Write a protein that binds this ligand. Structure first.
Ligand SMILES: Nc1ncnc2c1ncn2[C@@H]1O[C@H](COP(=O)(O)OP(=O)(O)OP(=O)(O)O)[C@@H](O)[C@H]1O
Length: 287
């Protein structure tokens, strides 16, 4: 027997935290507890009209399966006549992208710490057979203690035991972080997230993502050609790691099953001083 189903009247809604194409996230205080949640509100009619039932269902189903400190938690759901409501942890500090823009680019200690939390999160996700498929700084949020909270699971793929690949459109997902296999084979794998990881590490160090251009078509062209360069002074061991992640052949990316998994990735020299066992209990370095 769970707690009774919550209702809109149980909350004092506040500011809008963000607005997507099919949802709006609003800060809400539960009257009975004074707890604050980020409630994601989606209109049923619009979801049905635009054929998005599978994505909303997927977002709910994946989030309910995750139980790990580096993921946004789904605490409850409810609905009224027109809207679905998902009660989520409120990540007080916002998007990682905000910090990249604010401070410009991360020093080595900061890059290493945040990269480690992301790698630890992906290990967990991938161990559950889930491909994120849209990993990017916009969807890596930060809690009040400046630990990461990954979100945005509606476009995730859930692999079956028998399958390492899932059909996926590149035009879905964010161009700058799209893996070459989505553009060439229209298929996603766990290693697609490792490609995105390489883009993100590059972005933390350089301040901008590796594949940039005036439009999406031009970005995609750069991705399939591996057309990017490292800036001068890019931390040498991080460059080496990124070179091992931004690999056109998805089976040759450090961390993938064919490269023997997360062992060899976490053992990379860039992570030498990392203690992996309890990152969420360590004090993040100041940005
Ligand atoms: N759990 C949360 N805590 C704090 N802020 C959040 C939380 N979840 C989402 N946000 C913020 O709200 C924004 C809106 O999220 P939402 O899932 O509604 O759409 P989106 O993913 O940003 O855009 P789109 O769906 O069109 O790709 C996010 O981009 C983020 O800035």
């Amino acid at each position: 027997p769970q707690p009774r189903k919550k209702r809109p009247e149980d909350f004092k809604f506040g500011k809008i935290l963000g607005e997507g194409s099919f949802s709006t996230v609003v800060l809400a205080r539960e009257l009975a507890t004074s707890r604050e949640y980020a409630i994601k509100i989606l209109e049923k009619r619009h979801i049905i009209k635009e054929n998005k039932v599978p994505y909303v269902t997927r977002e709910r189903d994946v989030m309910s399966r995750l139980d790990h400190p580096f993921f946004v938690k789904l605490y409850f759901t409810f609905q009224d006549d027109e809207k679905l409501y998902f009660g989520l942890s409120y990540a007080k500090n916002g998007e990682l992208l905000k910090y990249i823009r604010k401070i410009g680019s991360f020093d080595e200690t900061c890059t290493r710490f945040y990269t480690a939390e992301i790698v630890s999160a992906l290990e967990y996700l991938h161990g559950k057979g889930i491909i994120h498929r849209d990993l990017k700084p916009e969807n890596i949020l930060l809690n009040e203690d400046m630990h990461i909270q990954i979100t945005d699971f509606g476009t995730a793929k859930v692999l079956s035991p028998e399958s390492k690949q899932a059909r996926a459109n590149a035009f879905v997902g964010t161009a700058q972080y799209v893996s070459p296999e989505l553009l060439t084979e229209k298929s996603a794998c766990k290693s697609s997230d490792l490609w995105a990881l390489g883009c993100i590490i590059y972005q933390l160090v350089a301040g901008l993502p590796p594949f940039r251009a005036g439009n999406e078509y031009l970005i995609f062209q750069k991705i399939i050609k591996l057309e990017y360069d490292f800036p001068e002074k890019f931390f040498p061991k991080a460059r080496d790691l990124v070179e091992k992640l931004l690999v056109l052949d998805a089976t040759k990316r450090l961390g993938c099953e064919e490269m023997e998994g997360y062992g060899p990735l976490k053992a990379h020299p860039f992570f030498e001083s990392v203690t992996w066992e309890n990152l969420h209990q360590q004090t993040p370095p100041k940005l």
